Amino acid sequence: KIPAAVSNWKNPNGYTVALERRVTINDGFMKLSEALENADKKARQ
Amino acid sequence: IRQKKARTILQHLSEAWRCWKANIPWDVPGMPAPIKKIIERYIKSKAD
Amino acid sequence: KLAVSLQSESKKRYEARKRQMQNINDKNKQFNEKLSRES
């Protein structure tokens, strides 16, 4: 069964369609931010 | 079954091409996997 | 009798489908109903 094609760009016949049809972080970032935070602490102290 | 199904399928093709140009991920829920492969095949050739 | 049977059965099928039909625009709501069948 092929679904009905609803485009987000086109509406040839002007159909008002149901709205719903018209509608993890890598660890390196943590390590980078932690290292920079420690470097800042070193500078302060 | 041909008469209406063809006009439906090629609308999915054209939508896939629009998604490719927009860099939107084309993914139609309940699309059959082989027809999905066929459409992506022709979209990739047009893209190239 | 064969001709009458075909005529009457055609009438019955036709009217039953009419009764089913009678239960923004006509085509737009038919499309929305098709989308409700899809789901």
Side-chain angles (χ1 to χ4, degrees), chain A residues 1-10, chain B residues 8-9 11-12 15 18 29-30 32 35:
Chain A
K1 182 188 291 180
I2 312 301
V6 172
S7 182
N8 202 0
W9 290 267
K10 297 286 188 182
Chain B
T8 310
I9 278 281
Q11 289 175 84
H12 283 291
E15 190 72 0
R18 291 171 202 121
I35 285 169

mmCIF file of all heavy atoms in Angstrom, chain A residues 1-10, chain B residues 8-9 11-12 15 18 29-30 32 35:
data_model
loop_
_atom_site.group_PDB
_atom_site.id
_atom_site.type_symbol
_atom_site.label_atom_id
_atom_site.label_comp_id
_atom_site.label_asym_id
_atom_site.label_seq_id
_atom_site.Cartn_x
_atom_site.Cartn_y
_atom_site.Cartn_z
ATOM 1 N N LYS A 1 0.832 -1.193 0.000
ATOM 2 C CA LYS A 1 0.000 0.000 0.000
ATOM 3 C C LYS A 1 0.873 1.251 0.000
ATOM 4 O O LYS A 1 1.803 1.373 0.804
ATOM 5 C CB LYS A 1 -0.921 -0.023 1.222
ATOM 6 C CG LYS A 1 -1.895 1.138 1.347
ATOM 7 C CD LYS A 1 -2.616 1.098 2.695
ATOM 8 C CE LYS A 1 -3.590 -0.074 2.791
ATOM 9 N NZ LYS A 1 -4.291 -0.114 4.108
ATOM 10 N N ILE A 2 0.579 2.170 -0.907
ATOM 11 C CA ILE A 2 1.331 3.413 -1.059
ATOM 12 C C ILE A 2 0.583 4.513 -0.325
ATOM 13 O O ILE A 2 -0.632 4.649 -0.534
ATOM 14 C CB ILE A 2 1.499 3.799 -2.538
ATOM 15 C CG1 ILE A 2 1.978 2.606 -3.345
ATOM 16 C CG2 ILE A 2 2.469 4.960 -2.679
ATOM 17 C CD1 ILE A 2 3.318 2.051 -2.848
ATOM 18 N N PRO A 3 1.224 5.250 0.581
ATOM 19 C CA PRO A 3 0.511 6.350 1.228
ATOM 20 C C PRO A 3 0.171 7.467 0.253
ATOM 21 O O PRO A 3 0.795 7.629 -0.801
ATOM 22 C CB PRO A 3 1.499 6.841 2.294
ATOM 23 C CG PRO A 3 2.452 5.713 2.491
ATOM 24 C CD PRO A 3 2.567 5.066 1.145
ATOM 25 N N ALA A 4 -0.866 8.220 0.612
ATOM 26 C CA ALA A 4 -1.200 9.459 -0.074
ATOM 27 C C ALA A 4 -0.070 10.470 0.068
ATOM 28 O O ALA A 4 0.466 10.665 1.162
ATOM 29 C CB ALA A 4 -2.509 10.028 0.442
ATOM 30 N N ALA A 5 0.293 11.110 -1.029
ATOM 31 C CA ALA A 5 1.406 12.052 -1.042
ATOM 32 C C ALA A 5 0.912 13.428 -0.600
ATOM 33 O O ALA A 5 0.103 14.057 -1.287
ATOM 34 C CB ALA A 5 2.046 12.097 -2.420
ATOM 35 N N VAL A 6 1.394 13.892 0.547
ATOM 36 C CA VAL A 6 1.099 15.224 1.066
ATOM 37 C C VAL A 6 2.389 16.033 1.025
ATOM 38 O O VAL A 6 3.360 15.708 1.721
ATOM 39 C CB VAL A 6 0.516 15.175 2.482
ATOM 40 C CG1 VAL A 6 0.402 16.577 3.052
ATOM 41 C CG2 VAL A 6 -0.848 14.511 2.454
ATOM 42 N N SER A 7 2.410 17.077 0.197
ATOM 43 C CA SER A 7 3.588 17.920 0.057
ATOM 44 C C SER A 7 3.567 19.060 1.064
ATOM 45 O O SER A 7 2.507 19.601 1.383
ATOM 46 C CB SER A 7 3.634 18.505 -1.355
ATOM 47 O OG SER A 7 4.802 19.286 -1.531
ATOM 48 N N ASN A 8 4.751 19.415 1.568
ATOM 49 C CA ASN A 8 4.945 20.634 2.344
ATOM 50 C C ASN A 8 5.219 21.837 1.444
ATOM 51 O O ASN A 8 5.211 22.977 1.917
ATOM 52 C CB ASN A 8 6.105 20.428 3.335
ATOM 53 C CG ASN A 8 6.063 21.382 4.528
ATOM 54 O OD1 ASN A 8 5.178 22.227 4.652
ATOM 55 N ND2 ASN A 8 7.048 21.250 5.409
ATOM 56 N N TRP A 9 5.428 21.612 0.150
ATOM 57 C CA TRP A 9 5.633 22.702 -0.792
ATOM 58 C C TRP A 9 4.431 22.988 -1.673
ATOM 59 O O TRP A 9 4.196 24.151 -2.019
ATOM 60 C CB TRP A 9 6.834 22.394 -1.697
ATOM 61 C CG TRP A 9 8.178 22.435 -1.021
ATOM 62 C CD1 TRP A 9 9.008 23.509 -0.959
ATOM 63 C CD2 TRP A 9 8.853 21.363 -0.336
ATOM 64 N NE1 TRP A 9 10.154 23.193 -0.280
ATOM 65 C CE2 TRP A 9 10.085 21.884 0.113
ATOM 66 C CE3 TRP A 9 8.545 20.033 -0.063
ATOM 67 C CZ2 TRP A 9 11.003 21.114 0.822
ATOM 68 C CZ3 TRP A 9 9.459 19.271 0.640
ATOM 69 C CH2 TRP A 9 10.669 19.814 1.071
ATOM 70 N N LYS A 10 3.681 21.967 -2.057
ATOM 71 C CA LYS A 10 2.655 22.089 -3.077
ATOM 72 C C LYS A 10 1.283 21.767 -2.507
ATOM 73 O O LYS A 10 1.152 20.978 -1.566
ATOM 74 C CB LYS A 10 2.940 21.152 -4.250
ATOM 75 C CG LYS A 10 4.219 21.434 -5.012
ATOM 76 C CD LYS A 10 4.083 22.675 -5.872
ATOM 77 C CE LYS A 10 5.292 22.845 -6.776
ATOM 78 N NZ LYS A 10 5.212 24.086 -7.594
ATOM 79 N N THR B 8 0.074 8.855 -7.941
ATOM 80 C CA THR B 8 0.452 8.961 -6.533
ATOM 81 C C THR B 8 1.959 8.796 -6.332
ATOM 82 O O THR B 8 2.605 9.573 -5.581
ATOM 83 C CB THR B 8 -0.316 7.885 -5.757
ATOM 84 O OG1 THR B 8 -1.708 7.953 -6.096
ATOM 85 C CG2 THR B 8 -0.173 8.070 -4.272
ATOM 86 N N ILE B 9 2.529 7.781 -7.013
ATOM 87 C CA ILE B 9 3.936 7.429 -6.825
ATOM 88 C C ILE B 9 4.835 8.570 -7.287
ATOM 89 O O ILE B 9 5.819 8.923 -6.610
ATOM 90 C CB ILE B 9 4.207 6.105 -7.580
ATOM 91 C CG1 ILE B 9 3.774 4.888 -6.745
ATOM 92 C CG2 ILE B 9 5.644 5.987 -8.090
ATOM 93 C CD1 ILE B 9 4.755 4.504 -5.656
ATOM 94 N N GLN B 11 4.287 11.699 -7.402
ATOM 95 C CA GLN B 11 4.248 12.788 -6.433
ATOM 96 C C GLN B 11 5.232 12.536 -5.312
ATOM 97 O O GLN B 11 5.880 13.477 -4.824
ATOM 98 C CB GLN B 11 2.841 12.980 -5.885
ATOM 99 C CG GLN B 11 1.860 13.553 -6.860
ATOM 100 C CD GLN B 11 0.464 13.613 -6.297
ATOM 101 O OE1 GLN B 11 0.106 14.560 -5.599
ATOM 102 N NE2 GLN B 11 -0.332 12.591 -6.581
ATOM 103 N N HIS B 12 5.340 11.263 -4.881
ATOM 104 C CA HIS B 12 6.363 10.931 -3.876
ATOM 105 C C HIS B 12 7.778 11.152 -4.403
ATOM 106 O O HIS B 12 8.666 11.577 -3.648
ATOM 107 C CB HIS B 12 6.214 9.498 -3.369
ATOM 108 C CG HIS B 12 5.101 9.325 -2.390
ATOM 109 N ND1 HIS B 12 5.151 9.860 -1.122
ATOM 110 C CD2 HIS B 12 3.915 8.683 -2.484
ATOM 111 C CE1 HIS B 12 4.041 9.557 -0.475
ATOM 112 N NE2 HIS B 12 3.275 8.842 -1.279
ATOM 113 N N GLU B 15 8.431 14.928 -4.389
ATOM 114 C CA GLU B 15 8.641 15.348 -3.006
ATOM 115 C C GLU B 15 10.025 14.971 -2.497
ATOM 116 O O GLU B 15 10.642 15.721 -1.726
ATOM 117 C CB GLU B 15 7.546 14.770 -2.111
ATOM 118 C CG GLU B 15 7.511 15.314 -0.683
ATOM 119 C CD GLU B 15 7.014 16.762 -0.547
ATOM 120 O OE1 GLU B 15 6.666 17.421 -1.551
ATOM 121 O OE2 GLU B 15 6.944 17.244 0.602
ATOM 122 N N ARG B 18 12.453 17.491 -3.910
ATOM 123 C CA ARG B 18 12.378 18.724 -3.118
ATOM 124 C C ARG B 18 13.108 18.588 -1.792
ATOM 125 O O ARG B 18 13.769 19.533 -1.341
ATOM 126 C CB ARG B 18 10.926 19.130 -2.856
ATOM 127 C CG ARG B 18 10.165 19.587 -4.080
ATOM 128 C CD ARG B 18 8.693 19.758 -3.790
ATOM 129 N NE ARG B 18 7.931 19.675 -5.031
ATOM 130 C CZ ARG B 18 6.981 18.787 -5.278
ATOM 131 N NH1 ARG B 18 6.509 17.995 -4.324
ATOM 132 N NH2 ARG B 18 6.436 18.746 -6.492
ATOM 133 N N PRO B 29 6.250 7.607 6.306
ATOM 134 C CA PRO B 29 5.890 6.429 7.108
ATOM 135 C C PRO B 29 4.987 5.474 6.334
ATOM 136 O O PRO B 29 4.040 5.884 5.657
ATOM 137 C CB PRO B 29 5.166 7.028 8.319
ATOM 138 C CG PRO B 29 4.612 8.322 7.816
ATOM 139 C CD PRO B 29 5.659 8.838 6.855
ATOM 140 N N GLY B 30 5.310 4.194 6.429
ATOM 141 C CA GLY B 30 4.563 3.161 5.756
ATOM 142 C C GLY B 30 4.886 2.987 4.288
ATOM 143 O O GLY B 30 4.170 2.234 3.614
ATOM 144 N N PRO B 32 6.594 1.316 1.280
ATOM 145 C CA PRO B 32 7.279 0.029 1.125
ATOM 146 C C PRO B 32 8.774 0.230 0.913
ATOM 147 O O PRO B 32 9.188 1.177 0.239
ATOM 148 C CB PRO B 32 6.608 -0.589 -0.107
ATOM 149 C CG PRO B 32 5.280 0.091 -0.185
ATOM 150 C CD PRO B 32 5.534 1.485 0.277
ATOM 151 N N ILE B 35 10.099 0.132 -2.964
ATOM 152 C CA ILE B 35 9.737 1.358 -3.680
ATOM 153 C C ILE B 35 10.525 2.548 -3.139
ATOM 154 O O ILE B 35 10.905 3.456 -3.903
ATOM 155 C CB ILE B 35 8.206 1.537 -3.606
ATOM 156 C CG1 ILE B 35 7.603 0.537 -4.578
ATOM 157 C CG2 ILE B 35 7.708 2.966 -3.879
ATOM 158 C CD1 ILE B 35 6.140 0.382 -4.456
#
